[PDB]
A = this chain, B = another copy of it.
Amino acid sequence: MNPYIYLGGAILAQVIGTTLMKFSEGFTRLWPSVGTIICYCASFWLLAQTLAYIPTGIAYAIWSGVGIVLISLLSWGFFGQRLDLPAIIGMMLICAGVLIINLLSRSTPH
């Protein structure tokens, strides 16, 4: 795999998984439930493979924060698309997170 394509897959898995679990309200359908756990385990594996390459606690927090803001922003657009302050600030936060991951990566000896 490519580590950024795999990261995009992990972001996609987080978006689908949170939404699917929210709709399900628990484990309802067995194949969705097992598949959701497997997609999260595959996503978690990428963090374990990237353990020393970037500082773990800050990296997880930035990825998680970007993820829930992205999930909320996608849900907000589904409710109705607004050029409003939380959506604008959410995009700025995601852009700052992407920039901060580069800065964390380049302040970590490769």
- List residues of A whose CB falls within 8 A of some B CB: 18, 21-22, 24-27, 48-49, 51, 55-58, 60-62, 64-65, 68-69, 71-72, 75-76, 79, 81, 83-87, 89-91, 93-94, 96-98, 100-101, 103-109
Contact = CB atoms under 8 A, between A and B. Distances in A.
Question: Is chain A's interface secondary structure helix, strand, loop, or mixed overall?
Answer: helix
B90 A58 contact: yes
A71 to B, nearest CB: 4
Contacts of A105: 72, 86
Contact of A18 (B56, B65, B96, B104): B56
Query: Quick one: which of A26, A58, A76 has the most chain B CB within 10 A?
Result: A58
Contact of A51 (B26, B56, B97, B107): B26
A109 B84 CA distance: 13
Contacts of A98: 65
